[model samples]
Target chain A: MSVERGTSNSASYKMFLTHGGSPISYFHDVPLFADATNNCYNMIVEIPRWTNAKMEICKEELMNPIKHDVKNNKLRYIYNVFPHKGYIWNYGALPQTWEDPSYVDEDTKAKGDNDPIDVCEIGSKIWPSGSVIPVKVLGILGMIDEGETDWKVIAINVADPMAEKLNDILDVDAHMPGFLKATRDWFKYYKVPAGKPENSFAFNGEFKNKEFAAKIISKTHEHWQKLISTKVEAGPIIRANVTVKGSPYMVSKEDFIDALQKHEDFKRGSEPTDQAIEQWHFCN
Target chain B: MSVERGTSNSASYKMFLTHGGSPISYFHDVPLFADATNNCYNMIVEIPRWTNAKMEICKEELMNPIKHDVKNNKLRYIYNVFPHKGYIWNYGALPQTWEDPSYVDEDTKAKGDNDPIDVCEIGSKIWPSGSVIPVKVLGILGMIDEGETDWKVIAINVADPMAEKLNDILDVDAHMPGFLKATRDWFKYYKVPAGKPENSFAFNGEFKNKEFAAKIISKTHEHWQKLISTKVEAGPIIRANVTVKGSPYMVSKEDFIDALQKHEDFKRGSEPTDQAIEQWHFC
Candidate 1:
C-alpha cells in the first residue's frame, strides 16, 4: 500500500540596525555564518562572559538543561566568549581518521609494516570520539577588542521531527508568554562578569556554583528574545533537537504501521501550525 | 614547345625608433599589433618627437617618407607617439564617404515627387576622393611613460614576396655605408618641433614647393639606407601600389595585360618574368 506524505513549509523574518549612518538590514544571507542545511530557524546570539558574576549564574540553570539535552539527543549548542575557542559536535557524524606515513621507522618498514598510521597513534594529535559532550567556557570577551562585541552563542538542530513538535508547543499563545518569561527571567538573574585578565572559566578555577552559570545562560536567552522581538537581531541562537525512533526488534509490517500511526496521532497536537508561523516567521 | 620563364627581383625597406623600452621580438604575435593576415613579426624603433627640434626633424625627415609611402603605396608604417591614435587600411582603396539625405528637397513629397529625377542631385556633401593611407604617426605607446621619451616606429610586411627581396638587399654589403650616412644627415637636418603638433606637415600650406618636397623625399630615402646599415633598426617595408587609369572607352583585359607587360619590360630593366616572388627577390 502507498503511504501519503506531508508537505513542509518555511517562514522568514528580518531585522535592521543603524550602522555607518544608515539603517541597514543585518539579516543578510551569509553562508559562512549559517549551517549548510536548513538555516531558516537558526539564530546567533552574543553573551559576554568577562564578568565573574555571569559565569557563576550560567553553571546551574544553563548547564543542567544543556547537559540533559546533549545526553538525551535533544539539543546541539556551541558557546564562544572572547578568551576561549571551542565547539561541540553532538549527534553529528564524527570526523574521519586520516593516516600519515612520514613518522614511520625504517625497521618497521623492513618488517613489511609500511602502512600509514593515524596521527593520534604517534601522540601528535587527539581525535574526538563520537557521542562525547564537549563544553568550554572562556573568560571575558573584552580582552580581544574594546569597540567590538566578541562573545557569541551558536546552536544548530539537525533533527527536524522534534523541532516540528517544539514549534507546535511554541505556536500555542498560552505557552509562548511563559516560555518568553522563563527565558527572560533566566537572563536577568545571570551575571556576566566584568573584564578580568584570567582566561579560564572552569568552576574549580573561578566561578563556584551551578546557579551562577544557569543565571548567565538564562540572561543570554532573555537578551535573544528581546533582540528578536525588537527586530534588532538575526540568528540561530536557540535550537530545538528532534528525533524519530524506530522499533528496536523485528516486527511485522502491520505492527510497524500501527506503531507509526500511533506516534503520528500523539504528535499531531504539537505539530507546527499557522499560529507558529505568525509568531516566529523566520523558522522553517 | 616548352620555354623557361624569366624572373625579376625588387626589394623594399622601412625604419623608425620606439620610445620608452624596446618591445619583445614576438610582440607582433599580440592580437593588437598583429597584421591583417595574422603573421607575427614584432619590429619596433624609436624616434624622438617631443622636443621642438626633434619634432621638427622627425616631421621633415621621417614623417615625409611615411606620408609619401602611404599615398604612393611604397611602404607600410605605424607610429606610437603622443595623443595616441592609429589607422590601418589597404592601399589603393578609396577613402570612406558619408551621404546625407538633407540634400533632397523637403517639400517635394507634398508635390508627389518622392524620388528626385536628377541623376546628380544637388546639396550633397562631397568628400575628396583619394587612396586611403595608413600613416599613424601621432600616438604614445601605452607601455611608455608620458612627458618622457616614449615614441616608436614599426614597419610590417605581410606580403611574402616583398620580404624575400628585402633580405636580398640587406645581404648586399657595398650599399651599407652610404645608407647609414644619408640617414644620419637627414635626421640631423630636420629638427622636430615641440609637441610635434597635428597636421604640421601641410604640403600646400607649409611645404608648397613640389621640388623642395621631392628633395626631402630623396634625402629621407638616403637616410633610410644609412639607418639600415647601422643595424639600429628593423623592417622589410615592402612597396605595393594600385593605379586606376581613367579612359573615355572601356579597356579589354587582353589589351590591359599587354600594356602592363610592356611597361614592366621597359621600366623594370627586364622582361615580364611572371614569378613575382623571384622577381622581387632578384630586384
Candidate 2:
C-alpha cells in the first residue's frame, strides 16, 4: 500500500507493514478496515444483521464489561456486566483509526476518546465474522461513553442491492422508521443500568447524513495517523472495565488462584487455564 | 355420574343416555359438554386447542364423511385442519343442552342451531385435550353461525384461585382485556378463506355478566329439553362446510374424491380416509 502521509512529517505519520509477525493488529493488518479504493472506512459485519443477540467485538470481547482483549493469546477476565450487556446488532468498528483523546469537534465542542470511532454495519445478510469489505456511510450516533465523546457510525453494505436504494442518510427515516428507532434504542439503554453516575447520549444523538459520519471518521483517521507505530512502555495493566453487582477488590497472583481453586462454581470450559490460575486470585 | 333430569321433561321433553346407543347427539352424551353440578357446565377441553387444527366431534363420523360413533373404536384420517380447523383456546361446549333450532332469543331475535353452545375455557396452562372439568363462567360472546345464535361462554378454571377473582362477566374488560379481544378475534377470523357467506358476531359480541351467560345455558337447556331423543329415519347425508377461495363450488361425492385422488396435491395424513372416500363423492 502507498503511504499517504498526514503531513510533511512522513516519517512519523507513515503506517508499518509487519509488527514482530503476530500479523500486527486485526485493525492495521486487515485491508477492509484499512485504506480502500472508495469511502472513508468500511464496517466489518461481525454477526449477521437482524439478530436479537447482544453486541460483541470481533475479538470475542463481551460489551457488558468494557474491558477485555487478546493479551498473550488468552482472555483477560475483568468482571461481570456493569450497567447492562450486549451490543444488540451486527456491530463492528472503523479500523486503523482512533479518535485521539485531544481531538475536539468544532460543532459540538465534545472531545474524542483514544480509540477508533465505532462502526455499526446494517445489512440484510449476516456478514461473515472478520470479513472485510467497503461500505457506504449512512449516519452517525453520538454517544457519551463514560465521559469521552464516542461515536458509532451507521453504514450499509456497498454490495447489497437493497442498500443501494438508500442513497441518502435521510432515507433511513423515510423508508425504515421501525429499524431507525431500534438502532437509537440499542445505543441509548446499552449503558443505562449502571447507577453510579450513569453514562448518557450527547445531543439529539442522530446525525443527519453520510457527510457528517464521513467527517468524523476522517478526523479520527487523521488523528490515528499521527500515532502510527509510536512505541510506548508496557507495564502490568488490568485491561478490561467490566460491570459488576457483587463487589469489587484488587487481587494478587496468590489471591485469585486460591480463591476459586477446587471450587465447583467454575463452569468447565470457563475454568481458568493453569497458567492463568496460578497467577491471580481475588473475591468478595 | 347420575342423571339429573330437567323436571319439565317428564314427557317427550326429555334427554336420555340411549338412543339404542346411537347416542342422541354431541350435546347429549359427553357429560362435560352436557350437565354439570356447578354454575358452569364443564367445558370438555378437546385434544387440539391453541392449535391450527379445526373443530371436530370426538366421534370419527365427523371425519369419515360412514360416520360411526363411540359405538366403535377407530380414528380415521387425522389431518392441519379441515372444516373443523379452528379452536384457539381450550375449546369445547356446554352440554346436555341445545340451542333449539326453533327457539328465538329475546335481545337478538336470532333462532337457535339445535346444538350445544360452544365454550372457550381460558387459562394459563394447556388444558389437556378431552379433559373434563367444571369451570366458572366469566362472560359470553354471541356469534351467529349458519344463521343460528351460537354463543361461546368465556370461563376460568374453578380451582384456579386467580380465576375466582373474576366472578362477573364484565370483569373481563378490566382484568383480561387482551384475552377478550383475542377470543373475539379467534372466532371472528377462524372462518376466513371459507368465503361462503361467512359467520359473524353481534355488536361488541360480549355477553354482559354471569347471569346473562347463565340465562343462555339454561334457555338452551330448556330448548334442548323440548327435543330429546327425537329420532327420525336415517338417510344419505354429505355434511361439511369447507372454505375455498375464489368461487365456492357445490360438492357431490364423485367430484371431490376424483378431484383429490387424480389431483396429486392433497397433503399426506390429511388425505380423505377410504371410508370417508368410498361413502361420498362431493365437489
Candidate 3:
C-alpha cells in the first residue's frame, strides 16, 4: 500500500494512503501495525528532517490528507534554534493511535494533545512528508506541551543500516552518542523562541525503555478503538473516512472523492512561504 | 584594516591581515586586545558555524595565514552529529595568545597543543573565515585531547545584539538553555566517529567563569612573549614576520611580499570539495 497526493498545493494539499489505487483515510484505513506479533508498526510521515513547515494529517477534515497547519489566519512554521536546523528527525505519527482528551494520563497528569501519537524516526535518510514507513520503537519521551500529554515515540526505520545494531534505548546511546539528550533539548525549548515559555515534561524529562513504550502504545491503541466506535463527540477530530466498515463515521466513496475535489486544484507553483520561517531564534 | 586573500583557494589559500593594503602577519601583527582595559580581545575566525572545513592560521608558515589543516596527507573536516550541523559556534583563535607546549596547565595536567588559544564565539552571526572581530570572553572549557591541553574559551562578539545581556557564563545558561551541555557533548563525541576515543576534560568538565578565564588568557599571553623573544629552538613555529620591530625574527618588507608571491596566483574558483565532506557521519 502506498500514499497518494491529493488536489492543491502548499496549505491545501492532502494525502491519501491507498490500497489498490483507491483513496482511503490515512487515520482509519491504515493499520496500526505492519506485523503485530513482532511489534513492527506503520508511521505516517508528516514532516521531514531539516524542514520548518508545519504539516500534519488534518484530523478535522474528511479522508485525513496531510495539509499545512494554520494558526491565526497564517501557516505555522517552527523556528530553528542555533544548532538544530529544524525538527532534527523524520517526524510523523503512528496510525490508529489516539490520546483521548477525556482521560487524564497516569504519568503526565494531562489530557492528550488531540492528535495521533507522534514518532521521531532516527534513521539516516530523510523521509518524504507523506511516506508510510515501518518502524521499530526503541524509546519514548513524555513531553508536557502546554499542559497536554504529547508522547514522542523514539523509533528507527527497520531497514536502516544501523537498525540491527540498535536494539534498545541503551543501544541508541552507545551508537549515536548525545542523541537522546539532544532530543530532550529539542522538545523542551522548541517553542521558547515563539514567545512561549519553555515546555515542561513528565517524569523529569526521562525517556522510558522500549518495553515501557510498547505498553503505552498498546493503551493508546485501545483508546483509538473507542474513539472510532463510540458515539462520543470528537471536539475537533473528523471521524469521517472512506473505509472502516460498519463504523458510524464511515462515509461513501463518492463523498470522499468529492472532498478531495473541493480543494483547490494542483497549480503550476505553490505559495511562497513566509521569510520569517527561515529565521533562526536563539534563547536560554 | 581589512584581511586580504592570499594565493590559491583550497588547502593552500592564506589570509593576510592588512594595513593600508600591505600584507602583514595575522599572528604577530594583529593586536591581542581591541580594548585592553575592558578585556575585549581580537579573534581570527578560521571556521564559521555550519561548516566542516578544518582551517586555521598556519603558525609554522612565514606569515601565519589561514590554511586548511592536513593530517595523514589528507585535508581534515570535523564530523557532524545529529542535531548539530557542524561546529555550532564561530570557531577561531585569539590573536596573540599561545598555549606553550613546555608548560603543563594547572587544571588539566597536560602540555598545550602548541598553537594559539582557541575561541568559540557564541553569537548569532555566521562570520566569514579569516575575518578578525572583537570578542568578550565569558568562560573557558578545559579539554584534554590526546593528552594535550586545549583550552576552549567561550566568548561572544562584542557587536552582537545580545552582547550586553550576556556578560558572564551564567548568563549563557540563563538565556541559552542546554547550550553549554551541548558544547561539552559536541567536543566529547566529535572524534569518536573517526575511530578515536572520546576526548576527556579537566576540572571535572566544569566551565570556569569570566574572571578565571581572564587569568588564563593573561598567562597564555605571557607564554607567547617567551615564545617570540627567547631562542626557544623555534620548534615548527615560524616567528618570521614583517612587523614587530626590535624582535629578533623581524624580516624585510620585500621578503614578506616575496613569501606570499611564491604561492600560486589567485584563481577564479576553488577546488571542488570532496563528496565525503557533505556526508553526515553518525557515530
Candidate 4:
C-alpha cells in the first residue's frame, strides 16, 4: 500500500492511500499489520518530527485523507514550548485500530478520544507526512485528553539503527535519557498554551511496558474489527471505504476517485505561518 | 580552512584546525571573518543540533581543539526538558573573538564569560561537529550565565533556505516565531535540572538586533587583538599557536603536530552512554 498526495501545503491538503491505483479509506483499508507474524504494524505518518503544523487524519471526511487541522477559521500550529520546536517524534496513527468512544477503558477508566490510536515513532530519521512504515511497538502512554482516553503508542521503525536492542520501554528509558518523562510532559502541557487544562494520564502517567502495550493494541485492533463489521454504531466515523470486503459501507472505486479529486491541487510551498501561532506560553 | 579529528567518540577527541598541511591553533589562526565586506563570520560548530553531548573548545589546552567537556570525571550531558531533546540549534562559537574576563559591557552590567563568543546558528540544517561555516548575524541574547555575560549570538548560514529574507532580529521573529523567547528560556532552564539556579539575562531577556550584535562581535574581536599582542593579560587562556606572524607565543609546526598526536587514538564506535545521563529531571 502506498500513499499519494491529493493536495498539499494548505489546510485543504490531503494524502490518499492507494493500492493497485484505487483510492481507499486510509483509516479503514490500510492493513493493520505490515507483518503480523512478527507483530510489525503499519503507521500512517500525519506529522513529521520537528514541525509545528497540526496535520492529522480527517475523521469525518471521505476516505479520511490527512489534512492540516483548522480551528476558528484559522490553521492550527503547536507552540514551541521552549526546548521543543514542534512534535518531537514521527507522530502518526496505527492502521485498522479504533478506540471506540462508547467503550470505557478499564485501565484509563475513560471513553476513547474518538480517533485512530496515535503513535510516536522514536527513530533516528524524520519521516515525511503521510508516509506509511512498519513499526514495532515498545510502550504506550495512556493520556487523558479532555476527559477521554487517548492512548499514545510508543514505537520505533523496524529499520532503525537501535531497533535490535530497544526491545522494551525500559530500553527506551535507558538509551534515550529523560525521554519518557519528556513524552509525558509534552502531552500534558502541549495544549495548555491554548488555554486548555493540563491533560492527565492513566497509571499516573507511567508508561506501560511493551507486553502490556501489545495487548492494548491487539484489543483496539479487535475493536476495529467489530467497528468495520457494524457490531458497534458509527457515530462520527466515516466508514465509507472501497476495499473492506463484506462491509455495508463499502463504496465503488469510481466514487472514491471522485472524492480524491475533489480536493484542491498541492501548492508549491508552505503558506507563511501566523506569528501568533508561534507564541510561547509558560505553565505547569 | 578545514579541521581533522585527532580522537573521536570519546572525551579525548580533539579537532585540529589545519591550513595547507600544518596544525594551527583553532582560536588564533582561523580567520575571524569569513567575508568582511558582507559581515559573514566563521562559526566553529562544537555541538550539532538535537544532540546532548556538552562539547566545547578547550580554552587552556594547546591549540584549543574541541573536546567533550568532563565534569567530575563524567562526560557531561544536557538535560532534555519537555518537548526538547537537546540543544535546539547548531551551537558553537566564533573564533578570534574572546570575551575577556576583565572587560565589562555597558549594556549587560556584567563581566565577560572568558571564552570565545558563543554563536547559535539557527539555520535550516544541522551541521556536523567541528565544521566551520560562514554565518550572518541575526541577533544577540545577553545571557548572564552564573553572573557573567555570555553573549549568545543568533545567526544563520549564508546558504540557508530562508537566508535571503531573514536579515535581522525582527526578521527572525517574523519568520520563525517564538524562537527568540524559546532560546532565552532554553538557557534560563537548561541548568536547573543539574541543581543550578535558573540563569538570568540582560535587558530583561529581550534580544538585541543584528546591528547591536555585530558591534558587540567587533568589540570582542578588538579585545582578542589586544590580548594576542600582550596588551591584556592572558590569564588562563593559552596563547600558543603554530602561526600568528610576529606573535611571541608562536610554536613550531612540528611541535603543534606532536601535541595533536599525543592524544589517544580515535575509538571505533561510541562509548555506551551512562543510564544516569539519560535520567529525566523535572525542574
Ranking by lDDT: 3, 4, 2, 1
Return the TM-score for each candidate structure: 0.13, 0.41, 0.69, 0.58
* Candidate 2 local lDDT, B217-236, one digit each (tens): 77776654443333222222
Could you give candidate 2's per-residue lDDT for residues A145-255 as a string of tens digits? 676788888787677665778876788666555456555655554433333334456566655588877777777766644444332322113112211221112211112
Mind giving the per-residue lDDT tens digits that candidate 4 earns over B1-283? Answer: 5454544556766676666666567777778889975889999998888778888888776677778888888778888764566787999999888898899888788999888899999875778888899999989999999989899999989998678999889998886666777788889999887788999988899899988898999999888776665554436646444354532253232133444453445435555565233333444
User: What residue runs in model 2 are displaced by over 4 Å at the alpha carbon?
Assistant: A1-24, A32-37, A50-55, A58-88, A101-114, A128-131, A193-200, A231-284, B1-283
TM-score of 2: 0.41
**Candidate 3 C-alpha lDDT tens digits along B1-283:** 5444533435556666666666667776777889976889999899987788888888776667788888787778888766677788899998767888889987899999988899999887778898899999999999998789999999999998778999999999888878899899899889887889989999999999999898998888887766665534545646545454432243232133444453444534556565234335665
lDDT of 1 by residue, B1-283 (tens): 1011122121222122221222111111111212342322212111111111100111222211111122133222233111111111111110110011222213121111111010100001111111111221111111111212111121213332223323322221132223222222222222122233222111111211223322322332233333322333332331111112321012121011112221112222233212111100000
**Model 4 chain B — which ten-residue stretch has the worst lDDT?**
B247-256
Give the distance in Å from residue A39's predicted Cα in candidate 3 to where it truly belongs.
4.1
lDDT of 4 at A193: 72
Better structure of 1 and 3 per lDDT? 3
- Highest DockQ against the true fold, candidate: 3
Task: Show the colliding residue pairs in model 3.
Answer: A15-A65, A284-B175, A284-B176, A284-B177
Q: Clashes in model 4: which pairs?
A: A84-B83, A177-B278
Give the winner by TM-score.
3
lDDT for position A250 in model 3: 43
Q: What is the C-alpha local distance difference test score of candidate 1?
A: 0.19
Q: Is the docking of candidate 2 incorrect, acceptable, medium or high quality?
A: incorrect
What's the DockQ of model 2? 0.03
Give every candidate's TM-score on chain A.
0.19, 0.59, 0.89, 0.88
